Amino acid sequence: SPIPQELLMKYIHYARTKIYPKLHQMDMDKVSRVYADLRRESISTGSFPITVRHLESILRIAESFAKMRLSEFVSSYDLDRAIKVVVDSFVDAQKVSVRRQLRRSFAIY
DNA sequence: AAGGGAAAATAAACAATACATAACAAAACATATAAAAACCA
Numbered sequence: 001s002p003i004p005q006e007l008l009m010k011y012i013h014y015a016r017t018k019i020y021p022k023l024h025q026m027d028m029d030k031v032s033r034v035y036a037d038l039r040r041e042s043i044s045t046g047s048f049p050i051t052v053r054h055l056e057s058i059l060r061i062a063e064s065f066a067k068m069r070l071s072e073f074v075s076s077y078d079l080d081r082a083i084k085v086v087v088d089s090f091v092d093a094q095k096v097s098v099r100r101q102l103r104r105s106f107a108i109y
Numbered sequence: 110a111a112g113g114g115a116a117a118a119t120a121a122a123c124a125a126t127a128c129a130t131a132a133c134a135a136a137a138c139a140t141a142t143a144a145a146a147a148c149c150a
Contacts, residue, residue: 100111 021066023059023074031058031079034108038083046098050090058082083108 003011032055039050061082066074087105091098 097112 015067015070019067019070021063021071021073023063027076028079031055031083034083038105041101041104045100045104046094048090048094054086054090058086061085080108 035050035055042048042050058079059082062074062078065078065081069075069078087109091101091105
């Protein structure tokens with residue numbers, strides 16, 4: 001069932017030394033819309049804010065998933081996994097009182 | 110339906126007051142006898 005270890009460690013060195021997947025401005029602006037919701041909802045219920053470093057982090061996580069997918073560019077649904085990775089790290093790094101944010105992020109989950 | 114958040118509860122240190130009784134005072138209740146005072150005689 002899983003990928004063997006030797007092929008995986010050879011794939012790491014093969015993908016990290018040959019490709020450089022960029023991003024195209026066709027429909028990527030939608031993540032700036034969802035960040036605009038996700039920043040604002042962290043002020044009213046949460047105490048810790050979300051900044052531009054999280055946007056740089058999800059673009060890096062999406063291009064890392066595109067690097068692992070070995071594509072020419074980042075797809076539209078790589079950002080969905082990137083925003084899931086940032087929601088279950090930032091929301092999980094807080095109190096139990098940000099519990100409404102567990103369902104507030106359920107619309108984009 | 111969730112949740113904020115103020116009311117309510119708990120605890121602990123400290124201060125302030127009440128309480129049980131000790132010690133006593135004083136008034137009611139009680140008797141005694143020598144001196145006055147009526148009082149028969």
